[PDB]
Design a protein around this ligand. Sequence first.
Ligand SMILES: CC/C(=C(\c1ccc(O)cc1)c1ccc(OCCN(C)C)cc1)c1ccccc1
Ligand SMILES: CC/C(=C(\c1ccc(O)cc1)c1ccc(OCCN(C)C)cc1)c1ccccc1
Lengths: 210, 220
Amino acid sequence: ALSLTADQMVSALLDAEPPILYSMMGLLTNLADRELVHMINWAKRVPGFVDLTLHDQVHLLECAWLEILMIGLVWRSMEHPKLLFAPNLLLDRNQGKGMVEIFDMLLATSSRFRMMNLQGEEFVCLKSIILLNSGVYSLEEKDHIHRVLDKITDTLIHLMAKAGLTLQQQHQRLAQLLLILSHIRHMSNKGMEHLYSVVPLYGLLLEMLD
Amino acid sequence: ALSLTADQMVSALLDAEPPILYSEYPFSEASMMGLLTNLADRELVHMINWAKRVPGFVDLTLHDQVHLLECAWLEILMIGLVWRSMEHPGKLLFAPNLLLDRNQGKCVEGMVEIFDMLLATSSRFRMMNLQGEEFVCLKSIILLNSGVTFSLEEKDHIHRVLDKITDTLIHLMAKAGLTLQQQHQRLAQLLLILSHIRHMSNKGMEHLYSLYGLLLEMLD
Ligand SMILES: CC/C(=C(\c1ccc(O)cc1)c1ccc(OCCN(C)C)cc1)c1ccccc1
Ligand SMILES: CC/C(=C(\c1ccc(O)cc1)c1ccc(OCCN(C)C)cc1)c1ccccc1
């Protein structure tokens, strides 16, 4: 549950991973939408999430879905200085031409991950963080959510330790990772805003959440 | 000033805080935005001078000083608001003479939701017994991290200062009796409350839509 050990955590999280998908606003809309159905399923497989209410499971996915899509998108693009929406569709920044500076922001985060040589294990933890931490703001599990988040913080450190960083680089990397989550909230917001020139609604979320 | 001990780094930052401002005022209407605009802009002038007092910040080039500040100001004001509101459950302390309960924010369409969010964050800081040293750390962390979407071997610099704060932030926690885990854990918690604040800051902007020249010359 949370009495998972940090290796059991990473084990779970890598196994939770949604498949790889293949295929203009229509392109990316249809694409997001599709990925959005798998995301619902991964959320379920995330340790600690299945513990919350439906009403709360749903709130959380309500609040995080777009950054979960972006940080994903940012991830698979690390190795293509180019956004690789799916193996078969891979756009450059010129191609963004009112969506250009969202792309610019994304390609920033993408290089910053390449620079940081981010790990699939580290990545995978960041995503669970975004799921739980996003909407965490009358007897409560916010307490619970907070516990699961601390588990993951420990899981993150634990990975860095295993990999043989010094205790100082551990707190340091953890920082520059959790800070990129800020950048990502932002691009997500700029995203939401531009999809008023939208949010997967409740009942549907809730019925698939089961 | 890259190398200077955690102790130094804290007092530097603690000793550079803008003054405490007072507001001016015939009971509230949507003339309250004007009221809050005003407070914003005065505060924003002093924030320029605090940016300059933050170690490493003047080392950056003028345009980057501006990029950073342009990108992080409302986020920097909100965290300040939040911070000073911590000792006053249920109300936002705009100025020492302008405590405002959430009810009052409902007198400007779309603001109550921001207010709610702020009061939540203010809660969370109190419940964490966030110390002033840690707050000062996070303010500077917002200045630095928010803009860091830009030769640019200046990013590298920004980053190393940022690590330097991290150290300083850890260092305090260490010195308050905190076991190693509890350190890594609280550090997470604070940096993760930084996301919450950008969110608020963006929400702020949108309902402030529905500047450069000034900051450049003002930053000399
Ligand atoms: C930047 C990529 C993107 C989308 C996207 C991101 C990652 C990914 O893996 C796939 C797509 C995007 C576009 C539309 C969108 O809304 C769909 C509405 N559905 C939920 C009914 C979501 C993401 C987008 C978002 C806002 C504006 C312009 C583009
Ligand atoms: C929530 C507080 C707030 C402002 C504020 C926050 C903290 C603080 O210490 C002082 C004020 C606020 C209001 C207006 C504003 O605009 C300034 C425009 N200038 C920069 C051109 C900035 C902040 C606000 C922001 C957006 C919409 C409604 C209210």
